[PDB]
């Protein structure tokens, strides 16, 4: 290991390995090519992971630019046009692992690192969320979460650029492989919002999160989206009417199994709803619920019927029985 040469020589050798790992190998054209050198690079990456994991005061000031340059050269690249996996994963996996341990080390000083981990770095990182490889997206997700946490100065930039990605997805391409992972990061951020909610965030709910419900591939990221929406209503109950009315607007207009995820989101909203907000939206909500109960899709009908077994929802229905019963049972009440 690096640990086994004299302490005077260790930084030099560490830098030397980081630079060797800037050599890039092709795993696609000829997959049996250069196996000896590929292994040399894998072992060097693995050695550097161990070295920063098991030693202290080894991330010195000259290490920072070398680490960031090594990451960039390996990771910032044009992406190709069940899932398609990244053939270079045997190396990229270890670069992600090492960079993560770099960020999480007790030696790590954000006041030094911020000179190299900047808006440009975050821009290029965020482009990689469109990777087809779910393992890459998973490492990216964790990495960006760590960066957002440790770099206060980058937080506004990260939020804005995720919004740019979301806007292009909604209004242009309707195709992006990592919406779910980005919403997962946003969920953790929304949960930490202070009160009262900044106007920036309410705009983000109303202009970004709600319109995400209209994109045809919604089912891929819907659980993560619902979680973000519910967190907003736990923070500020006065946003209930615009959220519920928008959800009702985006509700499928043919009977569909996709209504199941809409019923899930809506029940999760009702679980945190205030009685006075409930009365505002109960009539349109239960008109939709009545249609779902009568759905010719068995799973939709059953799913809607379960609302009656939610004790809290039933207490709200029962306190407003005179207005809700005639909607749920027109030929009776």
């Amino acid at each position: 290991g690096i640990r086994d040469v004299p302490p005077a020589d260790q930084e030099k050798l560490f830098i030397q390995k980081l630079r060797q790992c800037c050599v890039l190998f092709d795993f696609v054209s000829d997959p049996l090519s250069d196996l000896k050198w590929k292994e040399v690079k894998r072992a060097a990456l693995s050695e550097m992971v161990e070295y920063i994991t098991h030693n202290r005061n080894v991330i010195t000031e000259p290490i920072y630019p070398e680490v960031v340059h090594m990451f960039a050269v390996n990771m910032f690249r044009t992406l190709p046009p069940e899932p398609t996996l990244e053939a270079a994963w045997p190396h990229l996996q270890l670069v992600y692992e090492f960079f993560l341990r770099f960020l999480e080390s007790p030696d790590f000083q954000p006041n030094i690192a911020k000179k190299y981990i900047d808006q440009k770095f975050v821009l290029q990182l965020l482009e990689l969320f469109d990777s087809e490889d779910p393992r890459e997206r998973d490492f990216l997700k964790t990495t960006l979460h760590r960066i957002y946490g440790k770099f206060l100065g980058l937080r506004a930039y990260i939020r804005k650029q995720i919004n740019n990605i979301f806007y292009r997805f909604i209004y242009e391409t309707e195709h992006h492989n990592g919406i779910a992972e980005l919403l997962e990061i946003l969920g953790s951020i929304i949960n930490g919002f202070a009160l009262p909610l900044k106007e920036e965030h309410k705009i983000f709910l109303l202009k970004v999160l709600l319109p995400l419900h209209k994109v045809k591939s919604l089912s891929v990221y819907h659980p993560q989206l619902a979680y973000c929406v519910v967190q907003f209503l736990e923070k500020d109950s006065t946003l209930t009417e615009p959220v519920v009315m928008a959800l009702l607007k985006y509700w499928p207009k043919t009977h569909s199994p996709k209504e199941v995820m809409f019923l899930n989101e809506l029940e999760e909203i009702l679980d945190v709803i205030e009685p006075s907000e409930f009365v505002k939206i109960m009539e349109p909500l239960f008109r939709q619920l009545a249609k779902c109960v009568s759905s010719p899709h068995f799973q939709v009908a059953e799913r809607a019927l379960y609302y009656w077994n939610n004790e809290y929802i039933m207490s709200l229905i029962s306190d407003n029985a005179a207005k809700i019963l005639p909607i749920m049972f027109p030929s009776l009440y």
Partner: peptide, 8 residues
């Protein structure tokens, strides 16, 4: 899974 991040 991801820990909350407190606004600051």
């Amino acid at each position: 899974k991801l820990d909350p991040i407190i606004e600051d």
